[PDB]
Design a protein around this ligand. Sequence first.
Ligand SMILES: CC(C)(COP(=O)(O)OP(=O)(O)OC[C@H]1O[C@@H](n2cnc3c(N)ncnc32)[C@H](O)[C@@H]1OP(=O)(O)O)[C@@H](O)C(=O)NCCC(=O)NCCS
Ligand SMILES: CC(C)(COP(=O)(O)OP(=O)(O)OC[C@H]1O[C@@H](n2cnc3c(N)ncnc32)[C@H](O)[C@@H]1OP(=O)(O)O)[C@@H](O)C(=O)NCCC(=O)NCCS
Ligand SMILES: OC[C@H](O)[C@@H](O)CO
Ligand SMILES: OC[C@H](O)[C@@H](O)CO
Ligand SMILES: OC[C@H](O)[C@@H](O)CO
Ligand SMILES: OC[C@H](O)[C@@H](O)CO
Ligand SMILES: [Mg+2]
Ligand SMILES: [Mg+2]
Ligand code: NA
Ligand code: NA
Ligand code: NA
Ligand code: NA
Ligand code: NA
Ligand code: NA
Ligand code: NA
Ligand code: NA
Ligand code: NA
Ligand code: NA
Ligand code: NA
Ligand code: NA
Ligand code: NA
Ligand code: NA
Lengths: 759, 759
Amino acid sequence: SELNEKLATAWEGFTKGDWQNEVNVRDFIQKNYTPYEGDESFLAGATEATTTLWDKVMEGVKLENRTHAPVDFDTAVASTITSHDAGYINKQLEKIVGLQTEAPLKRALIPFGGIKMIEGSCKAYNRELDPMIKKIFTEYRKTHNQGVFDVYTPDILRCRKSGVLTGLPDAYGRGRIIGDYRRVALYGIDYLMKDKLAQFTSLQADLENGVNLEQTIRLREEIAEQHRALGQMKEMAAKYGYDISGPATNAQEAIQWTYFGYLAAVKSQNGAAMSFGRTSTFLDVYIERDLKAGKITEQEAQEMVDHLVMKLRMVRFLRTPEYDELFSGDPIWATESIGGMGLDGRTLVTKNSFRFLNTLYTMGPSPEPNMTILWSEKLPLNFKKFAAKVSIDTSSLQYENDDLMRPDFNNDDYAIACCVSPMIVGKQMQFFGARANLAKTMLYAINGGVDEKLKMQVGPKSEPIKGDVLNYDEVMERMDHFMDWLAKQYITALNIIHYMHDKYSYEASLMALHDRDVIRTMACGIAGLSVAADSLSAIKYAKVKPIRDEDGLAIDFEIEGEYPQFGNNDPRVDDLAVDLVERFMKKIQKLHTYRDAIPTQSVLTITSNVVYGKKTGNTPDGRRAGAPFGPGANPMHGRDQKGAVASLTSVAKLPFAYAKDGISYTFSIVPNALGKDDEVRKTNLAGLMDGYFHHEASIEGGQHLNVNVMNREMLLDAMENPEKYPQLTIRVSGYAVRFNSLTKEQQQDVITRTFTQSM
Amino acid sequence: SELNEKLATAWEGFTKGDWQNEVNVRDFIQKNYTPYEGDESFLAGATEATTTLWDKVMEGVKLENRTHAPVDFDTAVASTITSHDAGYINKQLEKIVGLQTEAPLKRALIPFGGIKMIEGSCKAYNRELDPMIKKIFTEYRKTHNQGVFDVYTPDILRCRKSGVLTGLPDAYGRGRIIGDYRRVALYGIDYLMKDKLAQFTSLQADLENGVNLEQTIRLREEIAEQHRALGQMKEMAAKYGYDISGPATNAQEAIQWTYFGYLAAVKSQNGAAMSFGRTSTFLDVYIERDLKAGKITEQEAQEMVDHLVMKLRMVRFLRTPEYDELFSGDPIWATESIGGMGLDGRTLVTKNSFRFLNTLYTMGPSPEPNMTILWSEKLPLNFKKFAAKVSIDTSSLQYENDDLMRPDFNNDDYAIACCVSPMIVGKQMQFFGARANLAKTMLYAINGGVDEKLKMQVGPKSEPIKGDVLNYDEVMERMDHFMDWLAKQYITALNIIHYMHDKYSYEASLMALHDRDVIRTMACGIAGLSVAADSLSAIKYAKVKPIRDEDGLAIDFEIEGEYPQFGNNDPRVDDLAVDLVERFMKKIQKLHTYRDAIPTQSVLTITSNVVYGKKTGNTPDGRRAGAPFGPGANPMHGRDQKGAVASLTSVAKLPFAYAKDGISYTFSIVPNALGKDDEVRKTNLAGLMDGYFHHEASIEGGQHLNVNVMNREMLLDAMENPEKYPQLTIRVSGYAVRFNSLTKEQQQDVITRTFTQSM
Ligand SMILES: CC(C)(COP(=O)(O)OP(=O)(O)OC[C@H]1O[C@@H](n2cnc3c(N)ncnc32)[C@H](O)[C@@H]1OP(=O)(O)O)[C@@H](O)C(=O)NCCC(=O)NCCS
Ligand SMILES: CC(C)(COP(=O)(O)OP(=O)(O)OC[C@H]1O[C@@H](n2cnc3c(N)ncnc32)[C@H](O)[C@@H]1OP(=O)(O)O)[C@@H](O)C(=O)NCCC(=O)NCCS
Ligand SMILES: OC[C@H](O)[C@@H](O)CO
Ligand SMILES: OC[C@H](O)[C@@H](O)CO
Ligand SMILES: OC[C@H](O)[C@@H](O)CO
Ligand SMILES: OC[C@H](O)[C@@H](O)CO
Ligand SMILES: [Mg+2]
Ligand SMILES: [Mg+2]
Ligand code: NA
Ligand code: NA
Ligand code: NA
Ligand code: NA
Ligand code: NA
Ligand code: NA
Ligand code: NA
Ligand code: NA
Ligand code: NA
Ligand code: NA
Ligand code: NA
Ligand code: NA
Ligand code: NA
Ligand code: NA
């Protein structure tokens, strides 16, 4: 209660409010940002420095893509916020600085999560691990991975081996946490440390009085670790020549300070998704102030945004080949949520919303950061059209429904973590759960719990379904049974994982940038939704005959008659998909969870569509053994054949009400199907999204849309001549990848997906 | 359910029972031991090997005592069960092998408990800590000490600084855990590992069903760590050339296997007390079988016992000078519980009970192991007299009331941890709490919570007592108030400490030798009982006038009139002491504890009588500022002036019912007061103990008695000429020390205590 000079100088001219007396970034934004309803005509192009820097870094990116391996990585240093010396691309040119290690794209060792994974990476990429690192993290500091495997059950291990529940966060950082990095810029580290000491002290009475004793002790230790991490952030920044004890005083510092908060996160944790947040409009407050004061020019502002975004394009983590199969394309999910509307009806689009999108022109297409447009039917048309143009030109953006999510939270300061999972910034996080194989679960119902590939009893022993023709009611009754079992094994695995991750790899630097009490959801994903829905549809509307082996195991199916497939706006099958989503949500909702994290569901797969597909045999819908499932909530490859409106309609029917962790849809449309020329294409794409996301009391609308605007012929050319397309980026599951970063098998999945040929 | 050949061979001839089908050491003992009612005439003397070995080790002991520092210690190795190579005194001579490090008396670094303490020891003893050890245990593996200090409150820190609650286990291993080391001998490691996997598996249903989720996950991880520690025990033993996968097959192996279980404990944990258990009668089963088979001679049996006991005399831990003030004399508390009676009325005294006592003759007096006689009025007179003779000759034994403790537990297989704290072996442990300063708490009541030395507000702000004469009712009402506050701060500190010790230094190798579910008590000790009781007595029966400074602070007292002092069998003051014990027990009983550990109390101080005394000003009883309190439950120095029966009577009145963690009494009697000659002295000492420990429905009896039989003139000679008394041992607080191991200040405390001059 008395702002020192540091705060005074930094906050000069800002509209006053609660944000000056307590940590409240949303209040600061609301009182200070400038809504922008204009067009992209004010945008500046790249400076020579930006191009020199990015062109150099791209040589490392090309090396990564051609070798499908890291440019370099540590073999003898355990990474922490302060372990590495300052690293640069070219110190004379960078306006925003900071790298994870001492060299661009060199990956770190983050051992707290597990030592076996590091050993696996060293073997895979032909480097020798320092014996000391192995010793420390085997005998002295236990890891998250070992804690989990020490407590797992034989049943969970069988599910992992068989492909019914695989790829969970037992061997990589859980992620799904977004510290509010904007807090570093707004308040400075010292203010945040004082606030954390107050939070710590506020728990003393409960501790002394024996109120929720263990929970209170745990939280006090976590806050002490958060406070320690904040101090370490100052030391890290000082290595780069910056004193971040006080608040940022100008645009360059606001961008730099925010990035430093994020840099501490990616130097200390290797979460699968390390998302950036909802920062562009916040940063516009500082940029606008400097532009009006004549302190910086628009080109200088674009340059600072470019250098920040360039650093987000350089975040890297050492991963194993196994991880690469589950999360393809060397992803980071440095997700940035752009635009949206405020609860007061004003748009949250700012000139900076345009500057962030402009990085796809100043430095070309790029998969990271994962730029996510928070769409509203009320967004300024100028912005709707520019975003559509950027999608048409680069296929690098995704869109999510602000008209659905803002009212659901009654909050206009939520951000997207990873692909499609919303959280109020600094107040909420998710316990990541990857996803379960719903399609294989259906086969288990038909086969009495016996795996169709391993011929091992994995699910509970049950009587396999008999007869030469499958009956929908019977199959669905057994499937419901196995969904109960799946939910229990899944939540049990996640309870173990998150208990161990809190114990052995607590994300102190990210949690330090959250309120004292954070809302946690237990995010359960489902893979193979359209395979399961179409399988049920074939059984219900056609005649499906099981082909059994000498043991009675259904290893194939013959289908007589046509049946409705998901993605063609046919309620007969779409209703089955909606039902499966509701059904699984209701089952996980009944189970006890670690830290009482609220169960939620997402229809999302990342590359588990390929991994689970490889481990799943022939299914009733006609899909062949080993074939990929569709990505996320997508109709199976090529089955949506009635056009864009029809497939968008089928997907929009899936209920966000029962899948609050998100519903991913990857939409690819050929240029000429989208429109006759550029202007018409922009108008039509904005129109398609307005219809898909349309929300009213009786219509939920879709929640997410990846948009690719390309001809399949071009991707085939890139498969044959990768050198011609070094920056070619494509949306694939709720994030983007450089097409050349994928393995051939992953490219085959992508090229056989639906390329929509009509409205 | 099918004993392999390993078990068959090892158990040949033993009486069958439950012990062969489940881990049940008590059942094995009950069905196989041979009660011995004879005398000491069968005992053999030392072999040349034993004398050669012990004489060599004693040179290291003399070096420790003269330098008051370790002979040597590690500066670059973090100790674990397998870290050190095999070490020997003289491999050609040892019948029982195993040392903590690679050299006799060389102390280890056990960093999991804290790195600052290690830094403190290195500085104090002039050795340089390896930078790598400091780095690992500051940045990679957090320690118990740092976890505690990260969560402590400013109030607890003020209590620690002021001397009202100091010396708690926030900077050293908590100890008070006795794994059942006999299990290694009886079953072998493989059988115990299979049993632990079954215990782990038995928790799967609760885990899956969400029953006490966090508790279940925690216990499963603990059992996995226990299983891992058992495997490490096999590797440790193999370094010494032994395969302990199967059960011990003869006496030498039973002793060796039991010792290996203990060796793993003292290589991995540095608990203040690392007690041995109740092993002598168990080991007699194997010795008796070999003697009857003619496999070994009695002298060979004594030699194996001697070599085992010699190793217990060599256990060492690196401690700081601060620790040395609180726990003087380089103590280990390798406590062994001898004799006692079974629930069936048979004595549990065996020939081995005599062999253990005989080590005080074969290798001379020694403070460790801490041999504790479980006394019963029904013990064979031959044993009562031999134990009395050993006390008369060596002052190295203590006695505890089996007639009180066995019926309290309805169990005849409990052992004493540290000094006086009983636990059923393998089924119970204590969360150690050190002790609180009850005397200073009384001054706080008189001074409104302000510390009499620091002039700082430590206790809650309260109105200091006014007037020129203190009133008992008023003082007691305020004291009760401050006892409530003390209890809450104490239990809060212990809740933090034990949560952190379970997290950062879980005693896996010891817990591996316990049942799945262990009963835990939260052991709270009180120091200064007789100072507080006598202060209340002076106030109540005499006229006590406070001497106040310019601030109204009572810094001294003048007493007009005589008043009854504790230890003279005067109910007027003894009732006050009994009341204080009951009062504090009732207050801690109301508080919530970590892991729902049952609060218990002990009247025990170790050297906190000196440390708290130094930090406590003048008290109402007349004790001067800085003077030591009495040890444990002892009357203040020299105040028990009516003889042995009178002081034993006062102490026996203290209620074990309200101090289940134990009540320590150190009794020293001059030889001629005890009896005219040797035979009379033995008879009289046994008679005094029979009376003190006498128990019936209406008489509890005393719980513990340290017995010193010496002339003060002899101790004065030892203070002046230590070289003349290298093995001189004396009981001091519930354990023994070599007199030469004490600092001069600690010796001054000891020499000014009461030397009883009459019955
Ligand atoms: C080693 C262990 C995992 C079982 O090993 P297993 O019989 O080979 O198990 P699986 O066949 O299911 O294989 C384990 C899989 O997890 C992988 N893995 C990842 N981290 C691992 C870790 N820390 N330890 C072991 N395996 C690990 C293995 O590489 C393997 O992957 P794969 O199927 O692609 O080859 C054992 O720790 C275990 O059974 N744990 C369960 C809990 C338990 O028993 N605790 C001890 C109780 S006393
Ligand atoms: C460093 C800290 C202990 C306070 O230090 P301080 O102001 O010097 O405290 P005190 O004066 O009471 O001294 C601490 C005593 O504990 C000792 N100590 C033992 N282990 C220690 C450890 N890990 N850290 C600090 N002191 C330690 C110190 O040496 C000192 O002993 P002394 O009184 O004989 O000199 C600080 O960690 C603290 O206040 N912790 C309480 C919890 C807290 O604030 N957590 C962070 C919340 S965001
Ligand atoms: O070696 C036993 C250790 O506790 C290990 O499990 C973690 O470091
Ligand atoms: O280590 C890099 C990964 O192997 C690659 O798949 C990323 O495209
Ligand atoms: O190793 C424990 C430390 O507190 C670490 O978590 C931060 O440096
Ligand atoms: O390190 C040994 C201790 O300093 C000594 O007090 C033991 O007698
Ligand atoms: Mg395996
Ligand atoms: Mg201090
Ligand atoms: Na290039
Ligand atoms: Na770190
Ligand atoms: Na860390
Ligand atoms: Na907790
Ligand atoms: Na729920
Ligand atoms: Na919907
Ligand atoms: Na349209
Ligand atoms: Na000697
Ligand atoms: Na160890
Ligand atoms: Na350990
Ligand atoms: Na627990
Ligand atoms: Na109680
Ligand atoms: Na008593
Ligand atoms: Na007597």
